[PDB]
């Protein structure tokens, strides 16, 4: 949950 | 049709344009926060343009610019520095990554405060820098590819400059021996884990063997 390097938009 | 069709199509004539290009010039920005000015980000702060912010439900400080008003197609860079080193490699990097001239609109760097020493985000991958293709039909041009690949070099021959040691690339990642600090996954058809077998797909991406040969 806190550690995605993930895009967020 | 899709950006990595695209680049599949077009993939020699894509490295042909970008190996006849010049060498790119990126005016860096010294307005900027050093990296404990940027854990104080909160809510707001900006610099060069870029929104600045380290209050959302994650361990990073996220920075965005607007971006020229194609769709993210999962393509984005990791860099990764020895664990002690982050401010001072942030600092180095600063004005590149707030440049006006960056192709990168939107980067983030772990708050190494909110981490555990031994975490994947704090042992390497300290930024993500995220790739858009820069076309309205969500396309990559020549002319932003070699401006992409000339701003990881640069990024790359700063933090060699400087003396920085390099990192723990994350095992989800790939890079050639070339670059000591930089790597790549593709976000739509790569996961966290990595291992051999996303490793080798991810190397045969198009994007990331237009970046590196």
Not at chain 2, 6 to 33: C, G, I, T, W
Not at chain 2, 59 to 86: C, N, T, W, Y
Request: with cysteine; net charge neutral.
């Amino acid at each position: 949950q806190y550690f995605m390097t993930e895009y967020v938009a | 049709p899709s950006t990595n069709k695209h680049l599949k199509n077009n993939f020699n004539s894509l490295h042909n344009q970008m190996r006849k290009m010049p060498v790119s010039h990126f005016k860096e920005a010294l307005d900027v926060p050093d990296y404990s000015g940027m854990r104080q980000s909160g809510f707001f702060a900006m610099s060069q343009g870029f929104q600045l912010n380290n209050h959302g439900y994650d361990v990073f400080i996220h920075a965005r610019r607007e971006s020229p008003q194609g769709k993210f197609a999962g393509d984005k860079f990791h860099i990764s520095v020895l664990r002690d080193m982050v401010p001072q490699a942030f600092q180095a990097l600063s004005g590149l990554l707030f440049s006006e001239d960056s192709p990168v609109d939107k980067w983030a760097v772990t708050d190494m405060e909110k981490v555990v020493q031994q975490a994947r985000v704090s042992l390497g991958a300290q930024f993500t820098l995220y790739i858009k293709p820069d076309q309205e039909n969500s396309q990559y041009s020549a002319s932003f590819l070699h401006k992409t690949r000339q701003f990881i070099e640069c990024l790359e021959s700063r933090l060699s400059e400087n003396g920085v040691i390099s990192g723990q690339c994350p095992e989800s990642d790939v890079h050639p021996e070339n670059w000591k600090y930089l790597s790549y996954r593709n976000e739509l058809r790569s996961g966290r884990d990595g291992g051999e077998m996303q490793r080798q797909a991810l190397r045969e991406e198009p994007f990331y063997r237009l970046m590196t040969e």
